[PDB]
Amino acid sequence: KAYLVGLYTLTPTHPGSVDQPIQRERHTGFPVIWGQSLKGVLRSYLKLVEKVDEEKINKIFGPGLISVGDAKILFFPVRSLKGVYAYVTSPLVLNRFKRDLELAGVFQTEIPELTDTAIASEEITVDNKVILEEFAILIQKDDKGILESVVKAIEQAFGNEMAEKIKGRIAIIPDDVFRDLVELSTEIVEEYIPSDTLFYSLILVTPRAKDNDMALIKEVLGKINGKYLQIGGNETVGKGFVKVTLKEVT
């Protein structure tokens, strides 16, 4: 079995590997949080905040019994003329997400290719385009209900509160533009991912597990749903606070 994890940054963040740049995928340039880091904060959180038994932890995480994946960006917040900001994703991102769900053992609605046009909520459209920082991006008419199936996916994967926050404020952009945005619209004071970014990660149970272990895992891990964590450097000046969701896949 698999658990799906949502990470919503509440505060500018510099995860893991502070004049050094944030970690990115070698071939895309997308920001990412390594599963090592992530495992770290999850474990240490179950120890220092949840008071879980150290032994239950060693049975689940090691000194293991699960795999904590790299968290990957699903929605990235961008300055938007109409609306104040938009949740920007893209076809590459969405497909990678669908592929990851399939790996988890799971969303069967065709994501459309886009190269020069966007599909967006109406709430952020100045007819007839979405305007994200510099770029004005021409909008195509959503007549396949893609936004509502995506809002639906958000709701099934991260809950009502998250789907609510996002709904009305969503834009699907050409991939290259999305990549430009996430490379050039990072928070600089040095570099941070913005404070309304949404990440997702998989937790996978080993096939050699028995039902007692599955029960153990379900219990311990369920204690992170709806909770607040810190990740990255600069914790004392208010950076890296995130809001975690956890969800048993079917």
UniProtKB/Swiss-Prot annotation:
Protein name: CRISPR system Cmr endoribonuclease Cmr4
Oligomeric and partner information: Forms oligomers in isolation. Part of the type III-B Cmr ribonucleoprotein (RNP) complex, an elongated RNP with Cmr2 and Cmr3 as the base, with Cmr4 and Cmr5 forming a helical core along the mature crRNA (39 or 45 nt in length), while the complex is capped by Cmr6 and Cmr1. The 5' end of the crRNA is bound to Cmr2 and Cmr3, while Cmr6 and a Cmr1 subunit (Cmr1-1 or Cmr1-2) cap the 3' end of the crRNA.
Organism: Pyrococcus furiosus (strain ATCC 43587 / DSM 3638 / JCM 8422 / Vc1)
Disulfide bonds: none
Stored InterPro entries: CRISPR-assoc_RAMP_Cmr4, RAMP_III_fam
One Pfam family matching this protein: RAMPs
Annotated compartments: Cytoplasm
GO BP term, example: defense response to virus
Domain of life of the native organism: Archaea
Family (UniProt): Belongs to the CRISPR system Cmr4 family.
